[PDB]
Every structure is written in C-alpha cells, then in structure tokens.
A and B are shown apart, each in its own frame.
Chain A
C-alpha cells in the first residue's frame, strides 16, 4: 500500500498568515491526490481533487500544488473558520490511503498553568475508592507533562489524563489528571503530589497535600 506522510503534525499560526501543508508519498501518484477539512467536532468537507482543482463552494484562498510524490496545500490569509483538521488522501492505487493529519492552532503568548490538587471526597472514601485529581488550567503552548509522586516517589500505574481543545475565548489549553487507588492503598502513604513541567518555567510547578493533615 502507498504510505502518505503528512507534515507537519500541527502548527500554531495567526489570522492572515500564509501557511503551507505538505504531503509526501512512498511513490509517484501523478496528481491523484485530494485534500480534506474537518472542522472541530464535525464531518469532512472536500477542498481539492486531482491535486489542484477546487471543490465547488470552496473559497479561492485555498490552493493545491505539487507533482510526482510531493504535494502541498496552501491557505493565503487565514480566516477564523480555517482553524481545523486537514488530511491528504491519494487515489492513485487501491486501497486509498490517508495522511496522518494536520491541525491548525491559534498562536498566542505563552502562559503558565494554574495548578490545583483535590484529595478524595468523603463520599468516595466510604465506598472503597480514592481518586486524587490535579487540574492544570489555561496554559500555552499545549506541550505539557504531568508527574504523580507518592511520598516523593514517581507513580505511573493508575493515572488517567484528559485534555481540552483550544479554548474559544483565550485560546489556551487545559488538562485533567486523575490518580485512582484503592482505599486500603491510599492510606499506606501520606504525601501526594503532582508535578507540572512546562516551557514557561525551568522549575516544575508543584502542588501537593498530606493525608489526615489539613
């Protein structure tokens, strides 16, 4: 099968910028390539077919180009609707194969996250479980690493992370990490920590608490 290497995986850009997505194939496909758009939480809309031909209804700021095994999708002057997911697809040979995908993200100034840790509720402890929650709200860029520590020692088993799409208002990201233990294992230890590693600080942002103590 033909492998479609789409690059970059994501880019942070602003309104009015002129950007270019590329798509590389494992062999020549002679302009038998299409381009696709998927707005957040919606379906797909065709942009280009046969390498350069616009689909009906598509604005003229979009444009496709390339030949052989190297093609490109270019957007002149980005609009607020253009921030979405984009995929390439070759139909030179069966089976049709797609690219990894490219997501256009709103660029903004860097911002450190607001960390907040939450011990298990009383209701959950009375049932036989224990979930420590660590919120990391409103930050940029999206690249972030969380690390759970029990009595100062790293813990990787039982972590459950979740990320939000880029916020519509301030164009920031947010993360939710949840460490789940049994009630019996949660009381074997005292200190519970979540470290946050971001490019906004060489030192990790640390927030923690001690069981029983408050």
Chain B
C-alpha cells in the first residue's frame, strides 16, 4: 500500500554476473543495516564463472558495491592414501545468501567434489558448499556436510543408499534465531533431497583451511527413505522456519518438495529432529507446489501462518482450457494442537507464464495496522511481461484477496524482477519496514522504501 514506487534506489553489479539472484538484509554489530547480494556468475581469478557476494552499504543513491571476498582457488589434499579435490568453476557462489547476527552465509550449490584413490574415484559430483563470513572481524569458515570419501564402487553395491554426492547444499538456506544454519539440499540421497543443520558457532570453531573433510559433531542431517513417493522430489528446494507445535523451546522446519510424489509437489513441517508433523500436498501436477515457502503471522493471533508458491499452476478457464499463471496458498495455523486444514485463501495469477508465486516475502507490518503483510512476485507478469510484485495486506481473517499495491518492473524485459525478495527490515530508519527486490537478469537490485500512509 505505502511503498514508494517513484523514488527508488538502484544497486548494480557486473554485466552477466546475475547480481541479485539472492539477497538479504545484514545488520552489523552496531545495528547499521546493509544489503548482502549474491551474484552466482561473477568472474573469478581464472576468468571463469565462480560466483561472488557483494555487501552494499545503505545509500539513497545506490550504485556499486564492494566485494565480500572468498577463496576461489581449487583445493587439493593428499591424505590417508587418498586425494581430495574441490572444484569451484561454475559453483554459483551467491545462488543463495542469508544473514544472521553479524554473520553472512553465502552458498555455492554447484561446487564440485571428487576423491581419488589409485584408479578408483568417488565421482566428480556437485556436493555444494556454503561460505561463512564475519565482515567486521574478517573471520571466514566453510561448511560442506555432503562431502564424503566413499568410492564409487561402494555406492553401487548398497543400491545408492545414503548417497550424498549430488546434494547441492546451500541451494536454499535459512538461519534460526538461536543461530542454527539449515541448508536445503534437493539433490541429496540420489535426488530425494535432504536437510543439513549445524550451529553457526560450531561451524566456525570446527573449521580450518586445507582440511577439506572435517567433522561437525553437533550437525544433524535428515534421513534417506525407500519410499518412491520421495524419489526425484527435490526435498529441500526451499526452506523456512517457524513455530508450529505450540512449544516455544523447539524450532520447527518448513521444507518444500516441488516434485514430490511424481511431480505432485508437497510441503512438510518437521521438528528439529526431522520428524514429520504435517504435510501439505500439491493441488495440480507440474505446478511446482513448494517452489517457495514463507512463514509469518498474517492474522495477528501470534500463531505463524504458512504460505506456499506454485508458480506454474494452470488456472481453469472457459472452454475446458488451462492457462499457466501461478498460485499462492495460505494456511492459517489453528489454535492449539491441531492439523493445518484446507487453504484459507487462494491467490491466483493473471498474466500467462507470469509465474505468480515464484517468490513470497514476509513484509512485516507495512501500513502499521497490526497485521503482518506479504509480497508476491510474478517475475514475468504484468501487461508487458516485464515482471510485477504485488502486496497483499494482513487482516483478522487472513489476507486480503486483492492487492493493495502493485510494483511494476523498472528494468527491461527479461530481468526476472522479483525472482528474489526480502522485506520486514527498516533500512533507512524511518519506522516503516522496506522491501528489496532482485533482478538478476539486469544485474541490479531495486530498493522500495515504505512511507507514511496516504
């Protein structure tokens, strides 16, 4: 409603770096807000795509940002009569970024890994890796839980059970308020998908450079399964956290699985031990129900609510014809220990191939009326197909069915305006929470400041 679409702030990165693929707000130790931006196709030292991360200070003018530097050199270690190998070419550093406290977690879902022992090998596979940084102190650390040293022959004998070679860890990410990093890995367990959790503080204390393979005892991974309903389900494509079991000492995890059960798609709510509390099933096949998940209390009853994006949902229309527009599902949490029922509200796109629901960002309370609000992206929507971001306001019964404000892309065609979103943070310190929108196709980020209500 009260975002300012006239005076925007534009940050920009190198041409072809996909600057804006991921973003988040980062507060330093003094509470000063900045913007962390991922660019998964930034060039490295060898003039080869490796990805990169930028830390943008808040300026109303915008402009260029300084790099948040990471090691981009392929590593090699000959230990234990084996040879460990990391490969950072086309790893996609910055395909997901997230901030917690004064720490930044940027991930390279496609960092490759291989282990050589004489003539055998573990196979060169994308285990992924996340780089952690404390910008004020310069501390650095890494976390790659799916790295293994088991040779290729062994996996074949055991029928590819507990195969973490293609995790792509860091594909999606989130950090609990307590400081436990949770990585979605949609390729883990031979493309079933797994989650990996570990406290940030233990990642730093247990990491040393050049080791490549090290233990993090406090870490916790999800479990493999022989159920074909999970096969090729990409469990971990998106991740989120919230309070869904009425126990405030426990933290619950929300996981998207957009090809679960033969591309029906699903979202599951679990405890910190990966025991399934509830499962939302997709409405339509190939709709990619689970592509994005968001957790926020929209109806102001203190109980978190769930939002699921199905960006390829095909709405039924006249003459038995379908039209791919995208859809968002809202689930309100019931009072006390009870199952989440049917969706409370269905938001359906309008523009063909617009992918309404590709990203869903909690905004906090935008108009300051006591109800938290959200923003939904349609990166190829709008009458021109350049992209749109729609704002839906909270209310006592859930969300409003019609948007309060529509942000049309200020970028050219193909910018993927809205592919990444992030809100609920007041960056200019005017009392109103603001919205940052990524457009990796144009290598830019647009900042929308919220202003008093008119």
Q: Do chains A and B touch in the complex (CB under 8 A)?
A: yes
Quick check: which of A78-86, A90-98, A117-125, A174-182 contacts chain B, the rest being far away? A90-98
Q: Are A93 and B81 in contact (CB under 8 A)?
A: yes
- Minimal Cβ-Cβ distance residue in B for A52: B208
Contact in complex: B77, A30 (CB < 8 Å): yes
A50 interface contact, C-beta 8 A:
yes
A32-B80 Cα distance, complex, nearest whole Å? 9
B68 to chain A, nearest CB (A): 25
Whether a CB of chain B sits under 8 angstroms from the CB of A31 is yes
* Partner pick for A50 among B78, B81, B211, CB 8 A cutoff: B211
Mask for A52-92, Cβ within 8 A of B = 1, else 0? 01000000000000000000000000000000000000011
User: Are A94 and B208 neighbours in the complex by a CB distance under 8 Å?
Assistant: no
Chain B residues 78 to 107 lying within 8 A of chain A, measured CB to CB, are 78-81
Instruction: Give per-residue flags for A161-189: 1 if the beta carbon is below 8 A from chain B beta carbons, else 0.
Output: 00000000000000000000000000000
Closest B residue to A32 by CB, please name it: B79
Q: Is there contact, CB below 8 Å, between A93 and B80?
A: yes
Let me know if A53 and B208 touch, CB within 8 A.
yes
Task: Please tell me if the beta carbons of A94 and B77 are within 8 angstroms of each other in the complex.
Answer: no
Chain B residues whose C-beta falls within 8 Å of the C-beta of A92 in the assembled complex: 78-80
In the complex, residue of chain A having the shortest beta-carbon distance to the beta carbon of B205: A56
- Tell whether B210 is near chain A: CB-to-CB under 8 Å: yes
- In the bound complex, how far is the Cα of B210 from the Cα of A91, in angstroms? 14
A53 CA to B210 CA, complexed, in Å: 11
Q: When the two chains form their complex, are residues B210 and A94 in contact, meaning their CB atoms are under 8 A apart?
A: no
Neighbouring A residues of B79 by C-beta, 8 Å: 32, 91-92
Contact between chains at A91 and B80 (CB < 8 Å): yes
Nearest B residue to A96 via CB reads B80
Which residues of chain B are near A50, meaning CB under 8 Å? 208, 210-211
A94 B211 Cβ-Cβ under 8 A = no
Number of A residues, CB within 8 Å of B: 9
Q: Flag if A94 contacts B78 (CB, 8 Å).
A: no
- A4 CB to closest chain B CB, in angstroms? 16
Interface residues of A in 30-50 (CB under 8 A from B): 30-32, 50
Q: How many A-B residue pairs have CB under 8 A?
A: 19
A20 to B210, alpha carbons, bound, how many Å?
A: 25
Q: Please, which residue of chain A has its CB at the minimum distance from the CB of B211?
A: A50
In the complex, which residue of chain B has the Cβ closest to the Cβ of A94? B81
B78 near A30: Cβ-Cβ < 8 Å: yes
What chain A residues lie within 8 Å of B80 (beta carbons)?
91-94
| Docked pose: A30 CA to B81 CA in angstroms | 13
Closest to A51 in B: B210
Interface size class of B (residues with CB under 8 A): under 10
C-alpha spacing A31/B212, complex, angstroms: 13
A202 to B211, CA, bound (A): 56
Distance to closest chain A CB from B218 (angstroms): 14
Contacts of B78 in A (CB 8 A): 30, 32, 92
User: Which residues in A have their C-beta under 8 angstroms from that of B208?
Assistant: 50, 53
Closest to B210 in A: A50
Give 1 or 0 for each of B176-211: 1 = CB within 8 Å of chain A CB.
Answer: 000000000000000000000000000000001011
Complex alpha-carbon distance, A92 and B79, angstroms: 4
Q: Mark B405-438, 1 if CB is under 8 A from A, else 0.
A: 0000000000000000000000000000000000
CB of A28, distance to nearest CB on chain B (Å)? 9
CA distance A139 to B78 in the complex (A): 48
Residues of B within 8 A of A93 (CB): 80-81
Question: Are the C-beta atoms of B81 and A31 separated by less than 8 Å?
Answer: no
CB A66 to nearest CB in B, in angstroms, measures 14
Q: Measured between alpha carbons, how far is A94 from B77 in the docked complex, in Å?
A: 15
A30 to B77, CA, bound (A): 8
Whole-angstrom distance between the alpha carbons of A91 and B79 in the complex?
6
Expressed in whole angstroms, the minimum distance between the Cβ of A146 and any Cβ of chain B is 47
Q: In the complex, what distance in Å separates the CA atom of A31 from the CA atom of B76? A: 13
A 21-35 binary contact with B (CB < 8 Å = 1; else 0): 000000000111000
Report how far A20 CA is from B208 CA in the complex, Å.
24
Task: List residues of chain A with CB within 8 A of the CB of B77.
Answer: 30, 32
Shortest distance between the CB of B86 and any CB in chain A (Å): 16
CA distance A132 to B69 in the complex (A): 77
Question: Cβ of A31: which chain B residues have Cβ within 8 Å of it?
Answer: 210
Q: Which residue of B lies closest to A95 (CB)?
A: B81
Which single residue of chain A is at the shortest CB-CB distance from B79?
Answer: A32
| Residue of chain B at shortest CB distance from A53 | B208
Minimum CB distance partner of B76 in chain A: A30
In the bound complex, residues from chain B placing their C-beta under 8 Å from that of A91 are 79-80
Name the distance in Å between B110's Cβ and chain A's nearest Cβ.
27
A30 to B79: give the CA distance in the assembly, Å: 9
What residues on B are CB-neighbors of A32 within 8 Å?
A: 77-79
Against A, the Cβ 8 Å flags (1 = close, 0 = not) of B286-306 are 000000000000000000000
Residues of A within 8 A of B211 (CB): 50
B74, chain A: closest CB distance, angstroms: 16
Interface residues of B in 298-333 (CB under 8 A from A): none
Contacts of B81 in A (CB 8 A): 93-94
Q: Provide the bound-state CA to CA distance between A92 and B208, in Å.
A: 17
- Determine the residue in chain B with the shortest Cβ distance to A30: B78
Interchain nearest-CB distance for A68 vs B (Å): 13
Smallest CB–CB gap between A71 and chain B, Å? 15
7 nearest A-B pairs in the assembled complex, by CB-CB distance: A94-B81, A93-B81, A32-B79, A53-B208, A92-B79, A50-B211, A30-B78
Residue positions of A touching B, CB distance < 8 A? 30-32, 50, 53, 91-94
14 intermolecular pairs with C-beta atoms under 8 Å apart? A31-B210, A32-B77, A32-B78, A32-B79, A50-B208, A50-B210, A53-B208, A91-B79, A91-B80, A92-B78, A92-B79, A93-B81, A94-B80, A94-B81
* Beyond A31-B210, A50-B210, A92-B80, 14 extra complex contacts between A and B, CB < 8 Å: A30-B77, A30-B78, A32-B77, A32-B79, A50-B208, A50-B211, A53-B208, A91-B79, A91-B80, A92-B78, A92-B79, A93-B80, A93-B81, A94-B81
